[PDB]
Amino acid sequence: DIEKLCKKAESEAREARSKAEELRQRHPDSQAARDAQKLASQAEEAVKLACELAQEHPNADIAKLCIKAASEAAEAASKAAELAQRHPDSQAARDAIKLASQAAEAVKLACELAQEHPNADIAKLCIKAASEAAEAASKAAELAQRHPDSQAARDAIKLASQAAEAVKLACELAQEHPNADIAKKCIKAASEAAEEASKAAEEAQRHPDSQKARDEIKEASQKAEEVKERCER
Fold first, then answer.
1. How far apart are CA 22 and CA 84, in angstroms?
2. What is the C-alpha separation between 93 and 85, in angstroms, rounded?
């Protein structure tokens, strides 16, 4: 069962890598192409780490959670790369690539934390937060593909990036203090930020001019900035 999950994750990572390779082949010295290469590398790394964790902890919840997270990260990578293919010389595409990179990094960090502390609830919290960050990245990329030059897409990408950064920081804090209440508070807050990012992106996908989507983006952004402001130590 776990094997097939790892295979699926691997396949998605391969999709991301294929798109990155297409970009690199078409325009080698392009910033977006190189960024996409690095992104594909990070997706592959996340998947590799997840599968390794699966080897270290057979049929453990932590393992399948990590594999699913890595799959989400690879999916986000693929979507960002595709956005880059559909819009060359586009700053939004580069920002989406960077976003997918941040999500990948968050998943990698959550997997490392899980490898260090497999039986800590903070590990599951961090994996969940990382997964939600990846999902938010995917939805922001979807929105950007659906409405390329829209304010909604840009704001969604920015918000998803902020949420990814917040999850990253909370996971670092958790790595420093795995038993600390503050680490749990931070990772839950970052999780909420990512969730709201996803919700807002979903709102804006259907209704790009949704004022509710904009308000949710505001709120989620303020939450992410608060997390990044409070969870440095």
1. 11
2. 9
